[PDB]
Design a protein around this ligand. Sequence first.
Ligand SMILES: CCCCCCCC/C=C/CCCCCCCC(=O)OC[C@H](O)CO
Ligand SMILES: CCCCCCCC/C=C\CCCCCCCC(=O)OC[C@H](O)CO
Ligand SMILES: CCCCCCCC/C=C\CCCCCCCC(=O)OC[C@H](O)CO
Ligand SMILES: [Rb+]
Ligand SMILES: [Rb+]
Length: 450
Amino acid sequence: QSGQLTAELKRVTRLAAPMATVTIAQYLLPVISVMVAGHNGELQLSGVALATSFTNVTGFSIMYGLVGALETLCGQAYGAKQYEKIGTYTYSAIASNIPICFIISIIWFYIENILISLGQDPDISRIAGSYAFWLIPVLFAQAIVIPLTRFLLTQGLVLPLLYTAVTTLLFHVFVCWVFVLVFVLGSNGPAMATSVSFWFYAVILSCYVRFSSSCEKTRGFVSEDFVSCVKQFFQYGVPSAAMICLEWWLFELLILCSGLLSNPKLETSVLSICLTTETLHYVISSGVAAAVSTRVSNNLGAGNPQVARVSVLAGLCLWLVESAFFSILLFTFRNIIGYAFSNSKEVVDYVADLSPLLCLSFILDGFTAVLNGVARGSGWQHIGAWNNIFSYYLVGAPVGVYLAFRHDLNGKGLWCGVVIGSTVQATVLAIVTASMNWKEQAEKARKRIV
Ligand SMILES: CCCCCCCC/C=C/CCCCCCCC(=O)OC[C@H](O)CO
Ligand SMILES: CCCCCCCC/C=C\CCCCCCCC(=O)OC[C@H](O)CO
Ligand SMILES: CCCCCCCC/C=C\CCCCCCCC(=O)OC[C@H](O)CO
Ligand SMILES: [Rb+]
Ligand SMILES: [Rb+]
């Protein structure tokens, strides 16, 4: 019980701290692209931003979201010591990612035409389509990279994941410098640089997995298990992708809706601050979520339902410390933190007025991240996808648009809808996790990976 929790707290933390740093590096890479570019003109900035929003919505959200299937399959397979199937699951995921990358590439070919038909400036549209075209190799590199990241994570190999992720980040800073400053490749420079970095990420990961002693038992695949693994990859990858797509889409929709409020420059700038602050906090809870998913899937696959419950409890301990830390820290500098993003007194005062709501977002996002990690580790990501629709699009979006436009709350009203949607999401997640039959979920894990 108490020693149960202490041992599981140790293992959850041993995975959460490196994975939190991994997520930091993940989200720092696009920020480095924007910073090294340091774009001078509105035409370039808008076109690149449109390419980023389009490629994230239609492509990158799916690529990252699909490997939640590997969090279920490879995690439970590692728990049952079904080590050969881990590599079969991983390589079935890579092979399945190839046609999806082709579909997304075809869509990205039409980004200029689609944006023009959507009433956007033709120069902006061409710049966006060109940037996205040079982001296409990132898709095929991620077809290897992302499944390999779960290949290492599900086995508890978070240190090589952290090493290669940070090494890729520093490599990306270098190639951004050479492409933007030395080669002077222009607006497409960072996009081309990203394609190089992720392919570099692809080779070092593939090199480690191929040659390390840690991956000797789990590397390789079984031919007669390929088709079945592909089936399961889609079975749990389709909802896992939907969960991420609905989270990223809502982010984009928030910014889009802020452009329709009065004084849209003020409301969009301030909403950009709330979003940046939200993701800045979410990298930590993402590391906790990855640790909870790994330990939940491992213990379920190992036939230990009780320690799986304890894994959720240990992750909730990390959530309470982490969320209380960032909430109180933000509330302390609520009247000051705005000056870290803008020199306008109006923007800083606005962010100061929203900071309590952002603190509530910290608590909820950390809680829902942990419980969504339980979903990915157990196998009911479909509940999480339908919960994302119900919480944010059926409840959060109508209430937020209402308060923003009706009660003249503007961006505060939009974030009020975010807070309410996150509240009902946490409530559903808490009810489904408290009513879970852990012995059956372990039995379902044993059958899922045989
Ligand atoms: C006022 C309205 C309140 C309700 C509104 C919620 C709408 C969104 C919730 C969807 C989750 C549906 C809950 C289904 C619970 C089934 C439990 C279950 O399936 O556990 C098996 C495990 O997932 C192995 O498959
Ligand atoms: C087999 C599965 C293959 C998957 C292949 C991709 C699937 C997702 C693509 C589109 C749906 C996304 C929702 C609609 C996206 C609309 C485009 C958009 O977001 O445009 C933004 C721009 O800012 C406007 O001005
Ligand atoms: C099984 C789950 C099925 C899920 C079914 C749910 C349907 C989602 C509905 C709308 C999302 C729209 C997504 C597209 C949002 C893109 C908007 C955008 O790109 O905004 C411009 C950007 O902010 C630059 O200004
Ligand atoms: Rb979210
Ligand atoms: Rb959000």
